[PDB]
Amino acid sequence: NALKSDFDSLRDQIEKAATNAKFNGVSIADGSTTKLTFLANSDGSGFTVNAKTI
Amino acid sequence: NALKSDFDSLRDQIEKAATNAKFNGVSIADGSTTKLTFLANSDGSGFTVNAKTI
C-alpha cells in the first residue's frame, strides 16, 4: 500500500509538472496545439516546430 | 498496577506531544483541518497536502 501511494503521488506530480510548462500562454509540451510556426524569412515563410506532448 | 500507571503516563505523553506540533498556528498532525493547500503556480493553482492526524 505504501509503494502504491508513492506511485500515485509521483504520477500526480508528473501531471502538475507537465501542465505548468507554458511561456507567454503558448506551450509545446502540454498537448494544446499540433504545431508552432515561427518567422524565418522577410516574406512570411515559416519555421515549423511540431508539438511533442509529454 | 505499576505497569498500568506506566501505560497511562505514556498515553498522556502521546497526547501532549501530538497537540503541541503547530507551526504558525497551523498544523497537519493534530487533526484540526482536512487538508492544506499551498501555492504552486503563478496563476493560483495549488499544491494539495492532505492531513494525517496522529
Resolution value in angstroms:
3.4
Enumerate the residues of chain A whose CB falls inside 8 A of the CB of residue B45.
20
Tell me the nearest-neighbour CA distance from B43 into chain A, angstroms.
10
| Distance (Å, whole) CA A24 – CA A48 | 18
Helix (H/G/I), strand (E/B), else coil: B9 = helix
Residue type, A49: V
Q: Which residue of B has its CA nearest to A13?
A: B47
Residue type, B36: L
The number of residues making up chain A comes to: 54
- Rg for chain A (alpha carbons), in Å? 17
Tell me the nearest-neighbour CA distance from B22 into chain A, angstroms.
25
User: DSSP letters along A1-54, please?
Assistant: -HHHHHHHHHHHHHHHHHHT--BTTB-SSSSS-SEEEEE-STTS-EEEEE----
Residues in CB range of B38: below 8 A, 6 or more apart: B46, B47, B49
Residues in CB range of A46: below 8 A, 6 or more apart: A37, A38, A39, A40
B47 touches chain A (CB under 8 A): yes
A4 touches chain B (CB under 8 A): no
Enumerate the residues of chain A whose CB falls inside 8 A of the CB of residue B47.
16
